[PDB]
Amino acid sequence: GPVSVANHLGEDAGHLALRRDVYSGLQKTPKSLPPKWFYDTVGSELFDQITRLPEYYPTRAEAEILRARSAEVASACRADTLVELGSGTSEKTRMLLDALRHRGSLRRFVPFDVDASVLSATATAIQREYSGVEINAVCGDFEEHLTEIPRGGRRLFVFLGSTIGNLTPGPRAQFLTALAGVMRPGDSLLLGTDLVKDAARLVRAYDDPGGVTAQFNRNVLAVINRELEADFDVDAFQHVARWNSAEERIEMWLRADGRQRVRVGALDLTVDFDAGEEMLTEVSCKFRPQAVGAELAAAGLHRIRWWTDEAGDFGLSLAAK
Numbered sequence: 642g643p644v645s646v647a648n649h650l651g652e653d654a655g656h657l658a659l660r661r662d663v664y665s666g667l668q669k670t671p672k673s674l675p676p677k678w679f680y681d682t683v684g685s686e687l688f689d690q691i692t693r694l695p696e697y698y699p700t701r702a703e704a705e706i707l708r709a710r711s712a713e714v715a716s717a718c719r720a721d722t723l724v725e726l727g728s729g730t731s732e733k734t735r736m737l738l739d740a741l742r743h744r745g746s747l748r749r750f751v752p753f754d755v756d757a758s759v760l761s762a763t764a765t766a767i768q769r770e771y772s773g774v775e776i777n778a779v780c781g782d783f784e785e786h787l788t789e790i791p792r793g794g795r796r797l798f799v800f801l802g803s804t805i806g807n808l809t810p811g812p813r814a815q816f817l818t819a820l821a822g823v824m825r826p827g828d829s830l831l832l833g834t835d836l837v838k839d840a841a842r843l844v845r846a847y848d849d850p851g852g853v854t855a856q857f858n859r860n861v862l863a864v865i866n867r868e869l870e871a872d873f874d875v876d877a878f879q880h881v882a883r884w885n886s887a888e889e890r891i892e893m894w895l896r897a898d899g900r901q902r903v904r905v906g907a908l909d910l911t912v913d914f915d916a917g918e919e920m921l922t923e924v925s926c927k928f929r930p931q932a933v934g935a936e937l938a939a940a941g942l943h944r945i946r947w948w949t950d951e952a953g954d955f956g957l958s959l960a961a962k
């Protein structure tokens with residue numbers, strides 16, 4: 642099938658987004674950064690290692706559900722088009738593409754992400770593995786370009802890995818409302834959500850003893866150093882995984898070991914870290930089964946299927962427009 646890539650992000654979209662977030666984030670109290678910047682080449686390779694850590698259950702848990710329920714997803718949604726809010730690189734991507742193809746229904750694939758070079762590689766890869774599927778990759782962001790996702794056919798939107806968990810309730814509901822807005826009656830959404838559980842298990846999942854997640858978090862300081870001429874003493878910042886009991890969410894912090902004076906060159910900004918000051922780099926909200934259905938209902942979608950893994954660690958929702 643023919644490959645297409647439509648690019649809606651300017652060449653300096655990423656850099657200009659990084660200046661904004663760093664300028665604003667390092668002047669908040671407490672200092673905070675979007676989890677958007679962990680993923681340069683190094684961080685992406687670190688995340689790949691994280692998914693194979695025994696402590697990080699979500700990847701395997703979601704995969705377990707998908708290995709069992711992918712056929713039912715295909716037959717219940719009846720989609721001919723797979724829209725992935727992601728890079729299209731996971732084996733989970735293929736599991737759903739196989740399930741739709743097995744029904745003789747796989748007609749189009751739409752990967753949607755911000756890295757045009759990632760989408761181009763995904764599209765070439767799906768093109769050799771799935772004869773007869775048109776691949777329409779869309780380079781855009783959630784805030785502006787959900788409308789640029791092609792229309793027509795019966796579309797199954799996919800958003801896995803409890804990545805919606807990286808949005809706080811306010812921004813999370815806006816995203817779901819906007820996503821439901823571009824969905825057509827008959828379209829469906831498959832959404833993965835990590836579930837609330839034993840706190841010690843959750844903290845361990847975000848601070849493996851080998852420190853891969855620690856390096857992954859500290860990697861954000863190198864990215865700021867390299868891209869905006871900052872002088873973060875990366876080794877003087879400790880990764881700290883916190884369980885927020887009141888908000889029921891995991892929080893990734895970076896703790897300054899001693900007073901730090903950090904100058905971000907490209908921004909003409911100097912910020913100060915008190916000794917023991919912590920900066921928030923990510924939130925990872927954990928969900929309750931009932932609450933996910935209410936959130937989809939609040940945005941205008943109707944959950945028709947809910948699945949957990951065998952241990953009840955992770956949940957998958959199939960909601961219809």
Ligand SMILES: Nc1nccc(-c2cccnc2)n1
Pocket residue numbers: 691802803804806807846847854857923925
């Ligand atoms: N996308 C996503 N969703 C949930 C958790 C995570 C995550 C972050 C940082 C380290 N390990 C896992 N990423």
